[PDB]
Amino acid sequence: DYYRISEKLPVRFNNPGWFHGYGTKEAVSMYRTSNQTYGSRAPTVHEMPKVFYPSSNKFSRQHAAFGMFQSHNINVTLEKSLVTGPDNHITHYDRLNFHPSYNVNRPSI
Amino acid sequence: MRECISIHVGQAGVQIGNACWELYCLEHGIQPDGQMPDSFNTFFSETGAGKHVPRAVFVDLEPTVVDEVRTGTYRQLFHPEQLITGKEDAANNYARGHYTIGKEIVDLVLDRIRKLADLCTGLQGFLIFHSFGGGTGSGFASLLMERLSVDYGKKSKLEFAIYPAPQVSTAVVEPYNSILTTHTTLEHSDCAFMVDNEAIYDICRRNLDIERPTYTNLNRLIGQIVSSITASLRFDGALNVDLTEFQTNLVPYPRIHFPLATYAPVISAEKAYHEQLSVAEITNACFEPANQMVKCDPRHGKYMACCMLYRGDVVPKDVNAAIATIKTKRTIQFVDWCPTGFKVGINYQPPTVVPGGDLAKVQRAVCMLSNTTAIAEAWARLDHKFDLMYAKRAFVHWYVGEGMEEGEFSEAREDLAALEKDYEEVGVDSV
Amino acid sequence: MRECISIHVGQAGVQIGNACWELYCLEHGIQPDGQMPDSFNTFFSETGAGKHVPRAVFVDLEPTVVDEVRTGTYRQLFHPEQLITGKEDAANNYARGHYTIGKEIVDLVLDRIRKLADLCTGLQGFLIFHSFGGGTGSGFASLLMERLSVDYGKKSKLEFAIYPAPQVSTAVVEPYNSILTTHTTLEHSDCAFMVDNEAIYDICRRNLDIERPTYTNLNRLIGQIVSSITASLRFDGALNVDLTEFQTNLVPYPRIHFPLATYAPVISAEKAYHEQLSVAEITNACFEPANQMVKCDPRHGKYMACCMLYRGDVVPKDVNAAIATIKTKRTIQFVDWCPTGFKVGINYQPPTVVPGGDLAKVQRAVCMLSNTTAIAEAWARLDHKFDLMYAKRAFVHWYVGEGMEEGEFSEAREDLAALEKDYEEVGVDS
Amino acid sequence: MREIVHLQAGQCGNQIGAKFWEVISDEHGIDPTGTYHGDSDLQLERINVYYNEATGGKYVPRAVLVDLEPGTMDSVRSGPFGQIFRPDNFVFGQSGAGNNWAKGHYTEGAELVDSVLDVVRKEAESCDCLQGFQLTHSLGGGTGSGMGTLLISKIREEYPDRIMNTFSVVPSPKVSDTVVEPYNATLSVHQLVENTDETYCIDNEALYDICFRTLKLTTPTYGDLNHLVSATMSGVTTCLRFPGQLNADLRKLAVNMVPFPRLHFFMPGFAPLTSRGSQQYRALTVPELTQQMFDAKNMMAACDPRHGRYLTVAAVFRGRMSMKEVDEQMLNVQNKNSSYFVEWIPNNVKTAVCDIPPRGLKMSATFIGNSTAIQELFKRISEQFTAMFRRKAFLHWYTGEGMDEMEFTEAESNMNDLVSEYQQYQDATA
Amino acid sequence: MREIVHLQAGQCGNQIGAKFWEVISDEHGIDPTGTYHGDSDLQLERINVYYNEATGGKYVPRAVLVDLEPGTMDSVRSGPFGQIFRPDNFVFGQSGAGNNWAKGHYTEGAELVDSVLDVVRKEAESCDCLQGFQLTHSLGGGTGSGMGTLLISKIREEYPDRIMNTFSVVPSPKVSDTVVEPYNATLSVHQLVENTDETYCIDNEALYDICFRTLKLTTPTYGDLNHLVSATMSGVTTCLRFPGQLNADLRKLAVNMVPFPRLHFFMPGFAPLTSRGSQQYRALTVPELTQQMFDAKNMMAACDPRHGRYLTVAAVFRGRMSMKEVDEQMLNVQNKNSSYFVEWIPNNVKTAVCDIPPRGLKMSATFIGNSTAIQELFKRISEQFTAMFRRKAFLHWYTGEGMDEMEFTEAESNMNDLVSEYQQYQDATA
Amino acid sequence: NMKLVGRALQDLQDEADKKKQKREEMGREQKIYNDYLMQRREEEKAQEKEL
Ligand SMILES: Nc1nc2c(ncn2[C@@H]2O[C@H](COP(=O)(O)OP(=O)(O)OP(=O)(O)O)[C@@H](O)[C@H]2O)c(=O)[nH]1
Ligand SMILES: Nc1nc2c(ncn2[C@@H]2O[C@H](COP(=O)(O)OP(=O)(O)OP(=O)(O)O)[C@@H](O)[C@H]2O)c(=O)[nH]1
Ligand SMILES: Nc1nc2c(ncn2[C@@H]2O[C@H](COP(=O)(O)OP(=O)(O)O)[C@@H](O)[C@H]2O)c(=O)[nH]1
Ligand SMILES: Nc1nc2c(ncn2[C@@H]2O[C@H](COP(=O)(O)OP(=O)(O)O)[C@@H](O)[C@H]2O)c(=O)[nH]1
Ligand SMILES: [Mg+2]
């Protein structure tokens, strides 16, 4: 009814009625304890924040609980291609061209 | 997850303890039963009954301060094993609280520290609250960190306490307690937060128009302090500030762990109605010695390191402009060996407002933590008043009769003189 | 961007501030709460929530005058921190307001002025209002100017003040305050606007037909003087004139910063029905000795500098014809070293009219700030009254009892004698 | 190709420059938005002289608006053609000079010069082949008379070969708007003689009597004064922007106009000035244009040429006319008024023809002329400068800025030497 | 083929990469889910430079995110493009550093270096031919300036021939947010000089300066700073990912930009930065990009190159241009500002052209340059580190970690010997 | 080019209106909270008389 709520804050901060259960101290008495001023009055709408954002930690809790990432693969050996063509992969330890050619004559290799 | 445990000590520690926590229940929005109708885990903890249980231990040597918590509003909020009491008190006697009465229940609290330390997985630091004047707030308090040091060596042990006011005093035998506890706050303390009630009295009457304050009004602002430091833990920020981060950027030397706080703005709702508040306005009020809560003038000394904890709808742009305006000033001095003496922290969360409080609801604020050498005059006044006792031995028979050797009085006086000398060496400028 | 902060001192300063800030409230349209239903930003400080706060520091040594403002119509308009009070006053004693009672609250006003101009980005100057008669307006004003100059070596200090009237007087020990204060307005001032209440008494009765005026009628007439000065800062004009623009063209020597003001037309509605008002008509009454706000005749002296401030439905054509017509008048004198002694300011917005005010609405206006040497005779009458006191040493024990040395009485008398001497040197024509 | 960067300084220069940018916007058919709504192709052929290209068929004025006070910039951007200028081109400080030349030239002008220097260097390097610069300001000010001269001295070192025209505003002695105006005037002419290719001394009083008699406007505002000034600057570059039978430019005139570098001061002239009652009884002819312009009453300087000798005379004509008639009319006036022309230079008149008439009019002409009678005003300034300076009046304002005293002597000496050699060319035997 | 693994360190870095991976995903048309909603086939031809393939037309980042405080990545994954990242690539410790270089480098960095080394090994072996790595961090932290240096030294031993680029954040002296900042800065650059192929000096204060002046943003957040920094990183590799008329990559720039291995610091600039008002009046051309870049105001480093000499200059262009206008410009800027370019290297500039413009824009440019101005920053830290270290202040924190005192001296010596030879390269004869 | 300039001016106007509406909402909200305070301070004195 009052100020535009942040629409991420829970309805506990949209309705001050949900914090019932306190304010049950009686003034108007000679036996009034000074410490009763602490938590003396139930809140209203006006004393309740427009914006609430959390720091949600379920984004880290399960990774922390189930351990950090590690890898114990023995060897993924993946000697690669120095030429972009899918037909040929000539390696630095290899001095030989692949994809044998189509020559009319002199096929001495 | 990052957690903090409160070890509130004495009548002070109990009274600020609940006052800090009536603010804690409201920011996260917990009903006094202990339910939501995870920002809370740094103080609260889920049980089998799924409520948010205090990680806070209350210890006192007099029960009448405790049962008003066990009979007050939040009785069911707390678990009564946490609230620790004793049959007899120290009665403004450091010796009784350290040697005779303290050793009865010293083990019992330590298990309760351990069980709470068991519950938390990664603890950040320990929040200790006591008072320099009372025997329980001095004697039992002094005992507990010394073994808390040897149990948890690496753990941060933060220190909030009431330093005796320079003129008004609730006690006459306070300096004997005050001098003797200073050993523990130097070899068993990481960072101190000494404050006197007199300067709090001056601020609220001058600013908040409350001509007749009480401890409650004082307790709410002190609660506003501890919320500000650990706010960066609770809710996110552009530049989060954990407890280790400002610990590093405040302490030049291990013997120098005595900074000074400041909270701004601190104004009444009527006067706040017609004053625009900006970053520069609130950061200038932090440097006014009329708003310091320790009866010392930083202009008489020099800042070694200033720590900044902004809070509210603050922009990093106006922060740097405010720092630049502050830096271009001559009476605001700095030590020669600290060209850059700022540690800035920013939070989007605005400070909440408690029912029956004094501070107006404001969209922005600032917390200030300067370590300055102008505090050197504070223990000097204590030294003159203590030396005005010990030469002719007033009240010594009480402390000797408890079972402790009068030679410790001279050594305790000597170390504070040495500590004052160390602050003078920092005041020296390089050739 | 332009900002002016009022430092009104004393009962005169507070009552003037009530009248002046009322006019500023109606000029920009300020509600008594302070909400509009950026010409205001020179005077009214805009807060975040749409609230506007005057940039003024009302200071007085007794609470009763300021408390009326605290319970007045504009109670919510002013900052309670701005309004500074004191338990005990100087009670027509410069010494009490300079060495015993001032120092208790010299410090507090400095921090309040500190906060006001810290909000401001570019401060033009300080408009300071006080009186030479009262102890607070003379004593307490003297220290703040002394402390303002060391805090602000460059910031301007205009000085609008009440001078003792030549014949009527509200106090007996007034010349002692008047003589001792004149040192401050010499070495800690940039321009000065001493006004005696007697001159307006004749002017209001002769022109506005109010046979029984009051301080509000006087304070309202002080009101648009500052408004017509600051009109160029607040509103756009053909010839905008800042305070630095007219400070330069009014002060030939640092020891001569005492010009004389003049406002025109000043005429009631039933009167104003019968005369067409033109630029020539209003500028001629600005030179008439019967309309001077100081009891002196410039026909006995010579003008050395004049600031022209037109306002309203004015045309630069009619400006020059009026200036030329003025210059062909032997009855007006001028010094040899100032062939051109005019500084014309032109503003668009005509002066607004306050309710309960004698002045009718007029489409055009005119303001004068003429520095002439005929003011020097006024100080001479003060010298006659002061010296004839000091021979018998009347009321001296009051000032000595406060803790100030009686030798300053002779020194202050000696300074003004030299000040009168300097004005005769300019009166000499080579 | 041949571009112009329009400099702009002070409240004076900003207002005429706003008026000047309005008129040539009408000539090139530019809306206040920035697009082109004209009809003829020649209306958009040479627009790159004054305008710079922007995307979406937009053009930006190539002007650098400078003022020490931000208030005039608000008035500039709030006009009809307020949103045509690039906001980056607006350079301004927070504090003015207060009619003090020394503050504008040394203290406060030293901070704003770097920002303006970067804007003009950005604009100058943008154009391919910059013909030269052009500046408008007032000599009776603090920024244009002050820092505006400092801008000239710096960029002449930077860009020596480029032409420098100034439409400087010379104060009149009959009517003055400043008291310290001789000091600002004297210390500026010394800067003019050293570094200026050509000067147009335009006097406001000489504008006023035109509106009284020539046009018979009851209420001539400053807009009318600026409009007449705007017509002059358009009439100089009209042949540059538009083709004609005999073309010219600024260097076409300045090469032909100054026999010696020490003489670069002219009296500008504009021909078609008639009142509304004069439109009924008139016949637009070339002789009427020549007859009206050679009248000294049409002159926008404060000097009667009949007391001096016409060294050189220009007549820049706008329209389609007979070239025989303009040839004959100049020949007739050269022979009729033989005594008023010097004899050592034959055919003292230079003419150019621009085919395009001004918008809304059929025939017009412009006149630029150097005559010996212009020393009548410089000596009159010395009549006022020495009168005030001999008593050291108004000196502490300047002396407080850090400058010495010999600057007044050397500036007076240069102008005394200037009028001395100016005089000798009057009585010279061929 | 030519792949890049993006290393991520510190709170500074984690927000930089998150903003970076947003804009490049926009450039490659990847939704928040991870699928490809693009339109041009060029938008998906070279994606595997940064992404890896996932089943279902999905793509995953090849980035490893490291921080000692777990609170940061929760803010990272809760962003708009947070779910795109793979949880295993997130690596974190339980306790932070507290801006302490020591605990991150020696004490707690030792526990975390093993895990990050595994995933970067896994990402390395996944791709065909890695071009090199890329790490972003801040020099004022405890992890990025601390542990973040430990990964570089490890991967240089493991992968020496691969390129190593680092877009570090160097603290500013005027605005500093950490007291212990000089100790961390002095102990990080020594690690930076020994093991790094290429480094960019990014300062927040300079970034703060740009949005104040160039963009005129009233409330610029840190995201706008991340917007500018990510714009720099995209413009570096836009020639790698997309074809152009003149191609380049990291190694083409790396070979040309360091004449000697000891100087691998370059200050980057971004061309098309205009405020929204500035978009109204502009004409988008190659010279305007050259103009706006070659202003020192546009720079996001805290050093003015006017005080130094340009060693080498690089300008990578994004869009479709005709390079004759491009190529004529750097030839000119070399010639005119000949004093700021060294003479022992002719034709100091190398340029690259990428055909594909940035999304939502027509043309842009990025600049990489080596000047002598960078020693202005290192000696500035020396002015501050020596002041802190002469009194042994804040030493016990670093001393408690088990390091000796000679490490500060040698790191001080290494940075001093770096600037000493750096001065000699400034004052060298051809 | 005209697509680009239209987009830029639209964004500028949108953010201007957003800032204006936030400022408009802010001022009214503080006013109401004050309205709670005047009654809240009215009950406490009315409570005090009853004691
Ligand atoms: N600021 C503040 N100080 C308090 C408060 N309660 C007690 N103190 C201070 O504590 C000092 C005395 O110690 P107490 O806490 O009262 O009692 P104690 O510490 O348990 O020691 P004993 O009195 O011997 O039982 C006094 O000088 C007070 O200044 C409080 O609620 N707020
Ligand atoms: N014109 C005018 N003069 C006033 C007004 N109020 C006070 N004065 C002058 O002030 C003089 C007396 O000093 P006050 O201003 O009343 O008091 P003060 O300046 O605070 O000094 P103290 O009386 O010592 O406290 C009288 O002679 C009046 O001339 C006013 O409203 N209008
Ligand atoms: N003719 C004419 N003169 C003007 C105009 N605006 C100002 N002036 C003259 O400029 C002089 C004041 O110049 P000023 O503002 O002090 O110049 P600045 O100090 O450089 O800004 C006055 O004497 C006016 O007569 C105008 O629109 N037209
Ligand atoms: N430019 C920019 N700087 C940032 C940003 N976030 C943090 N910083 C800077 O990073 C520094 C803090 O680094 P820190 O978190 O201690 O690094 P870490 O110890 O490695 O985690 C501060 O000085 C900030 O100025 C950002 O988004 N942009
Ligand atoms: Mg107790």
Ligand SMILES: [Mg+2]
């Ligand atoms: Mg009084």
